[PDB]
Every structure is written in C-alpha cells, then in structure tokens.
Design a protein around this ligand. Structure first.
Ligand SMILES: CC(C)[C@@H](CO)Nc1ccc2ncc(-c3cccc(N)c3)n2n1
Length: 328
C-alpha cells in the first residue's frame, strides 16, 4: 500500500526543498537527505483531475521510467559495460496525500522567479496517489551552464563523455534516450583528471576538464533486456511532433521519420540525432570564458565543427565513439 508524504519528506527534508524544474508529468525538487544532496521527482498518478493540460498517468504508464532509471543506475557498478555517465536512483515510493504546503511554498518561489508552465498543484485531495523518485544529485544542467564553461576543450570533453555513456548503454541495454535536450545533461565539478568507462570489456579514459557529465530524465527512453522492451509509446502523440523555435523540436520529428512511428523498435540513430542537437548548442548558444584565439583552441573548434557536419552519417553512439576522428 502507499505511504504518507511524511515517509519520504519528513519535516527537515521538506523545509530544505527547492523547486528546480518541471514537466507536464512532474515537479522536481532538490533537497538534502542525511547531509547529502538529492533530486526528487514527484508525479501524480491514477486520479481524475486534469493536471498541466493532461489526464494523469496510470501506475502502469510510469513503470517504464522507473525500470529504465533502475537499469541505468546499475551501470556505474557493472564491469563489461560500465559508466558513471547516467545518474543513481536511490528510491521509488508510492505516496498518498494532498500536496504538502511546504512544497507549495517552494513551487510558488519558482513561479515567482523563473515562471511556471504548470498548474499550482494545490487541488489534490488526501487520497491522491503520487510516485516519488529520489535521484542522486547530478549537478547543474548544461543550459544553466551555457555561459559558465571554460572553453571549447571543455565542450569536447562533454561531447566525448555523452557519446561514451550512450555507447555503453546501447551495448548493454539497446538504449535510446529520446529526449536528450540540454536540460537533461548535468555537469558536476570533479577533481578527477580522467574519467573511466568500459565498453564491451575494453576500458578507456576521457580527460574530464574538471567536469563529470550525467545524462538524466528517462521519461521518453527505451531499452530492452532478454527481448523484453520497455519504452514510452508516443505513436498517438500529436503535440510532441509539432513544436518549433528550437532544433530540439525537429529532433522529435526526425526520430519519428527514422523509426516510422514504431517506438518499440531499436533505432540508436536517435542517440546520434540528440548528440547532433547538443553539438549545435555548443557551437551556437554557449559563451566561454576563454575564446578560441590560440592555435590549440582554434584546432579544437575546427574538430567540433567537422564532428557537427559528419556525425549524422553514423549509425549509433557506439559507431561515433569507436569510429569518429574527434575521439582519436
Ligand atoms: C528538473 C530536472 C529534470 C533537471 C533540469 O535541468 N535538474 C536536475 C538537476 C540535478 C539533478 N540530479 C538528478 C536529477 C534528475 C531529475 C529528474 C530525473 C532524473 N533522472 C534526474 N536532476 N535534475
């Protein structure tokens, strides 16, 4: 049976909650649990009220995100296919209750500073069910870091880390992220000079440039184990394919073109498309502390541009990692 909100969010944890983002199907808070930062995603399920312009998901419809979050969380401790490039999942609970007023206060603060596209979640009754996912805190998203990166060399590390992480997940799980916009790439400072990954038993390293990248938020993702596919079936979703104003919204249409609107199949070219979108953001929407005015830096820029114009001729993140000249 479900637990009360207080099981997951006792007073002190609740008091430290700050809202950090949102989607149609969730609110996300950062807080501190046992002196440790965490991110908490809270999703309303099974109720009759419209929420953020949509009917609520059923428990069965949230299960794919839970399962995929659990699988990717395991990758940091695997051996043949190992990466720390996703994020840890600490716990999942089913909670029952109306929304805590301290969370509403956090929600209000975010709406007042950043502005929200969601309904204030103050209409839920005391029988309302929610899924609460607690993640390891992964740092600051790439969008918020768009003016904060040191140079194009940092952008190259980030691209290499992302590619490697996706390759490891493709190899182990036939994984596609499918929604890898720049809010779903997190950066955290590290004193490690090199990061390690293993792809089908071969270990390699990547210079960190002082940052560990984490890929997050598996709401649209797909994977499989033992021929059992877990995915988000968007084949009847109209709106996902009619966005504009950002190349992000072209990617949804390009994925659908690639897969013929069959979301259960494995099309790792979708990972390549997202990587192309991310390279585009790096070349166009980032400001760097150090400009590309030395020969060394100018060469890195040329290499990233050459990656941008050639990567769409590759079939998967694995193909990019193993064959693209950027990573040699
Ligand atoms: C609002 C979320 C989606 C995200 C937007 O940049 N911000 C953060 C920041 C730190 C952080 N650590 C873990 C997570 C997180 C949040 C939602 C889903 C997942 N898988 C991971 N997040 N999300």
């Amino acid at each position: 049976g479900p637990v009360p909100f207080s099981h997951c969010l006792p007073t002190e944890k609740l008091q430290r909650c700050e809202k950090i983002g949102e989607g149609v199907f969730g609110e996300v808070f950062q807080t501190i649990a046992d002196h440790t930062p965490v991110a908490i995603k809270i999703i309303a399920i099974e109720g009759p009220d419209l929420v953020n312009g949509s009917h609520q998901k059923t428990f069965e419809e949230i299960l794919p995100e839970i399962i995929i979050s659990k699988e990717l969380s395991l990758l940091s401790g695997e051996v043949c296919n190992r990466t720390e490039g996703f994020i840890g999942l600490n716990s999942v609970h089913c909670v029952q209750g109306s929304y805590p007023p301290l969370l509403l206060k956090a929600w209000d603060h975010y709406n007042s500073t950043k502005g929200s596209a969601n309904d204030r979640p103050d209409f839920f009754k005391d029988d309302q069910l929610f899924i609460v996912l607690e993640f390891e805190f992964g740092g600051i998203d790439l969008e918020q870091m768009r003016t904060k990166l040191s140079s194009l060399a940092t952008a190259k590390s980030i691209l290499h880390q992302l590619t490697a992480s996706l390759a490891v997940a493709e190899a182990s799980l036939r994984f596609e992220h499918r929604d890898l916009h720049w809010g779903n790439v997190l950066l955290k400072k590290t004193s490690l000079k090199k990061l390690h990954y293993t792809l089908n038993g071969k270990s390699s390293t990547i210079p960190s440039c002082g940052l560990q990248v984490s890929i997050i938020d598996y709401t649209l993702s797909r994977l499989e184990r033992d021929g059992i596919v877990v995915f988000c079936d968007v084949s009847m979703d109209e709106d996902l394919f009619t966005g504009d104003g950002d190349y992000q919204f072209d990617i949804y249409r390009l994925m659908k073109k690639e897969n013929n609107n069959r979301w259960g199949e494995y099309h790792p070219y979708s990972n390549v498309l997202w990587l192309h979108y991310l390279t585009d953001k790096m070349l166009k929407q980032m400001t760097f502390k150090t400009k590309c005015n030395t020969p060394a830096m100018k060469q890195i820029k040329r290499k990233i541009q050459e990656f941008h114009r050639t990567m769409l001729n590759f079939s998967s993140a694995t193909d990019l990692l193993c064959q693209h000249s950027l990573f040699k």
